[PDB]
Design a protein around this ligand. Structure first.
Ligand SMILES: OC[C@H]1O[C@@H](O[C@H]2[C@H](O)[C@@H](O)[C@@H](O[C@H]3[C@H](O)[C@@H](O)[C@@H](O[C@H]4[C@H](O)[C@@H](O)[C@@H](O)O[C@@H]4CO)O[C@@H]3CO)O[C@@H]2CO)[C@H](O)[C@@H](O)[C@@H]1O
Ligand SMILES: OC[C@H]1O[C@H](O[C@H]2[C@H](O)[C@@H](O)[C@@H](O[C@H]3[C@H](O)[C@@H](O)[C@H](O)O[C@@H]3CO)O[C@@H]2CO)[C@H](O)[C@@H](O)[C@@H]1O
Ligand SMILES: OC[C@H]1O[C@H](O[C@H]2[C@H](O)[C@@H](O)[C@@H](O)O[C@@H]2CO)[C@H](O)[C@@H](O)[C@@H]1O
Ligand SMILES: OC[C@H]1O[C@H](O[C@H]2[C@H](O)[C@@H](O)[C@@H](O)O[C@@H]2CO)[C@H](O)[C@@H](O)[C@@H]1O
Ligand SMILES: OC[C@H]1O[C@H](O)[C@H](O)[C@@H](O)[C@@H]1O
Ligand SMILES: [Ca+2]
Ligand SMILES: [Ca+2]
Length: 686
């Protein structure tokens, strides 16, 4: 199958995601609607259940609302059963309409539908070439009070009907009891409760195995992707083991939410996206787009800096999920704002690198402040809005023009208000011109592109006041006027002679697992696939066609490899680096080192005899370790994904910058468990 197939669960770069708040989209089955104080059919009280369900989504999939818009993927509310309690916060009732208060990850939320309804949703979506991404929030269960056991449902967790335990009298330690986080540090935000939500303890074997079995169930139901909730609030090491469990079973595109504010560039965020096994929602992109197109707090130079910086900071920038707003931000469109701003931000996002996500109702110009005002019921299913037509025209390009899906990004023209960028992949090109200035036109002269000689019609058809482009030799475009608020898209597609890799997924798995290499020019006959210097051909290449290759990871030592391919003729492609071959199945193990004193600025790290521990290379050491919540300095701890059942040798390091001080004596040693978790506690050796 081609890279653009709906069956491609490893690549969403050619897709356009539509984020659906199930309850606020369409109530297709009134029979499953909650009742009493937990329901408001009018959806005036945005804190109660409005009735939106999976049958409603099925209806909108079948009546052409999404397909006519060019949507090829949906991201829905967490499908698992949530608490039924109606929580009263300051005299205001609240329900789990949002799906983030799980009580059983192995059952469905009755309000959305039954297992059968979910299956019909998967079937209906795939029948229309629409992939399905589910929200998954394994950080917590639901609101609970240690002082008030009767509050809500005490965060009780069930395993397919069987009660495992609650927040009160948690003798099993299924949850964290370190109070609440003040977001002062990453560690503080991870090992303490997020607000009043019962924080799950992933170091507890029962919780570890349970959550991993739970995701398996949803994978078996046919989901095509996973949106991980609050990934900045769970042990990064455990999440890696979680992604390994997913990829070593049935790999599907996964991206987590790591909120970033305006002007916030986070190195930890980058590292997480590059090493966890999942990508992230591109808040850096979203915030900058809002600054430039919505709030006027930065110009096109800032937009360019974001594009160039992100392309360098993210190993796989094309896996980052972009957007202009979501359920945790005020609606992009302000009630009194010119609609062209939203239209431009949409056009920009739909043609930029990554995986575009459109928050439901954006195409209907919905306005609203912070939660819950940004989660109103979609007012209309009109296909006559300008925004709907913009999506309709640009969304399909991610499918037909690989430059949009996998291409590099280069600035071709720029000033305070104008940005003309070019996307390029092989013999495919796309040039987008955007003039955010709603009152002043711009004279575009000296524009040079990679577009072949000829005339180009604006893909938007002048919908956003775009214009035709005339290109001479050398890719030089004739002078033209870019209208105020003008937005135009010019493109060219053609066959690519040389093998070109545009995407690889998953990017982390053990030998034997099948990976998907997408691009152009691979040819029809099986060629060769390279993992570092190791060549793979024949049988282990399950399938091979011009845009997609399915190949099994060779039995090579765990580590980081560069992926490259060659057609039957032997012509090599570009290299797609940063692929992590695991040393085997993964288990989350907590390492604790006692009495490791340090100076301010100096931190303790973990190094070991397996790639998961960086193979004794201080540069790839695990950490910096923590020393405040679960254990206190001079004791340090950290949760790490390591190969199950392997005997591993390790040592700790004290690092200040890149300067390292090795622990003395002989290496420590232990054998990781075959499944579940474990805690290895040793003393720092002088
Ligand atoms: O009951 C609590 C609350 O839960 C909400 O459900 C989740 C939400 O849908 C999901 O996006 C996420 O949102 C939280 C972020 O994960 C978390 O990091 C935090 O974000 C703050 C940053 O940490 C700060 O650095 C700074 O940027 O400010 C950010 C504020 O957004 O808080 C987010 C909001 O909770 O996790 C939520 C919890 O599971 C429900 O949607 C909501 O109705 C509930 O009230
Ligand atoms: O590089 C692979 C080896 O990495 C680890 O070895 C560490 C030692 O654990 C650490 O004590 C330190 O050894 C130095 C030693 O203390 C000093 O007297 C000598 O002059 O230099 C040694 C280093 O050259 O650093 C090494 C890493 O260089 C690991 O313990 C070992 O099993 C690996 O083979
Ligand atoms: O002509 C090559 C040149 O084109 C662009 O330069 C623009 C510039 O961005 C505008 O602000 C204005 O000054 O007109 C110039 C063209 O005459 C590219 O930005 C530049 O890198 C490139 O060399
Ligand atoms: O907790 C984070 C913090 O840990 C280390 O700080 C130590 C410090 O080095 C000790 O001398 C002593 O003051 O205890 C501190 C922890 O409470 C790291 O050195 C520091 O960089 C880091 O932020
Ligand atoms: O300041 C809080 C928020 O205000 C507005 O919603 C901006 O669009 C957004 O970028 C910012 O994060
Ligand atoms: Ca319903
Ligand atoms: Ca947590």
């Amino acid at each position: 199958a081609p890279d653009t197939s709906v069956s491609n669960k490893q690549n969403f770069s050619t897709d356009v995601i539509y984020q659906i708040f199930t309850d606020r989209f369409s109530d297709g089955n009134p029979a499953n609607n909650p009742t009493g104080a937990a329901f408001d059919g009018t959806c005036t009280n945005l804190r109660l259940y409005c009735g939106g369900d999976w049958q409603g989504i099925i209806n909108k999939i079948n009546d052409g609302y999404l397909t006519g818009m060019g949507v090829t993927a949906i991201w829905i509310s967490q499908p698992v059963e949530n608490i039924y309690s109606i929580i009263n916060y300051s005299g205001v009732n609240n329900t789990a309409y949002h799906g983030y208060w799980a009580r059983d990850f192995k059952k469905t939320n009755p309000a959305y539908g039954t297992i059968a309804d979910f299956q019909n949703l998967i079937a209906a979506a795939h029948a229309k070439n629409i992939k399905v991404i589910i929200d998954f929030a394994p950080n917590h269960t639901s609101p609970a009070s240690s002082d008030q056991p009767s509050f809500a449902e005490n965060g009780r967790l069930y395993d397919n009907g069987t009660l495992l335990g609650g927040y009160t009298n948690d003798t099993q330690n299924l949850f964290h009891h370190n109070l609440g986080t003040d977001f002062s540090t990453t560690e503080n935000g991870i090992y303490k409760n997020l607000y009043d939500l019962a924080d799950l303890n992933h170091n507890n074997s029962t919780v570890d195995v349970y959550l991993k079995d739970a995701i398996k169930m949803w994978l078996d139901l046919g989901i095509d992707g996973i949106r991980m909730d609050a990934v900045k609030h769970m042990p990064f090491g455990w999440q890696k083991s979680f992604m390994a469990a997913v990829n070593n079973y049935k790999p599907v595109f996964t991206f987590g939410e790591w909120f970033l504010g305006v002007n916030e560039v986070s190195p930890e965020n980058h590292k997480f996206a590059n090493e966890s096994g999942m990508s992230l929602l591109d808040f850096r992109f979203a915030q900058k787009v809002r600054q430039v197109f919505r709030d006027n707090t930065d110009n096109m130079y800032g937009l360019k800096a974001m594009l160039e910086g992100s392309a360098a900071d993210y190993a796989q920038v094309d896996d980052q999920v972009t957007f202009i707003d979501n359920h945790d931000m005020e609606r992009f469109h302000a009630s009194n704002a010119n609609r062209r701003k939203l239209e431009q931000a949409l056009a920009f996002t739909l043609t930029s690198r990554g995986v575009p996500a459109i928050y439901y109702g954006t195409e209907q110009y919905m306005s609203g402040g912070t939660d819950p005002d940004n989660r109103a019921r979609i007012p209309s299913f009109s296909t006559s809005t300008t925004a709907y037509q913009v999506i309709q025209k640009l969304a399909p390009l991610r499918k037909c023009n690989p430059a949009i899906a996998y291409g590099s990004t280069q600035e071709r023209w720029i000033n305070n208000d104008v940005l003309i960028y070019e996307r390029k992949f092989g013999s495919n090109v796309a040039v987008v011109a955007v003039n955010r200035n709603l009152n002043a036109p711009a004279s575009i002269s000296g524009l040079v592109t990679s577009l072949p000689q000829g005339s180009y019609n604006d893909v938007l058809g002048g919908l956003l006041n775009g214009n035709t482009l005339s290109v001479g030799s050398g890719g030089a475009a004739s002078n033209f006027t870019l209208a105020a608020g003008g937005t135009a898209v010019w493109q060219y597609t053609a066959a690519t002679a040389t093998p070109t890799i545009g995407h690889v997924g998953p990017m982390m798995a053990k030998p034997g697992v099948t990976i998907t290499i997408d691009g152009r020019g691979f040819g029809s006959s099986k060629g060769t696939v390279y993992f570092g210097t190791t060549a793979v051909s024949g049988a282990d290449i399950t399938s091979w066609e011009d845009t997609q290759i399915k190949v099994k990871i060779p039995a090579v030592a765990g580590g980081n490899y560069n992926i490259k391919v060659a057609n039957a003729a032997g012509t090599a492609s570009n290299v797609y680096d940063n692929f992590e071959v695991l040393s085997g199945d993964q288990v989350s193990v907590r390492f604790v080192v006692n009495n490791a004193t340090t100076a301010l600025g100096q931190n303790v790290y973990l190094t070991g005899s397996v790639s998961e521990l960086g193979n004794w290379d201080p540069a790839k050491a695990i950490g910096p370790m923590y020393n405040q919540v679960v254990y206190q300095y001079p004791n340090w701890y950290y949760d790490v994904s390591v190969p199950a059942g392997k005997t591993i040798e390790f040592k700790f390091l004290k690092k200040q910058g890149s300067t390292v001080t090795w622990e003395g004596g002989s290496n420590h040693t232990f054998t990781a468990p075959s499944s579940g978790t474990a805690t290895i506690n040793v003393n720092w050796q002088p």
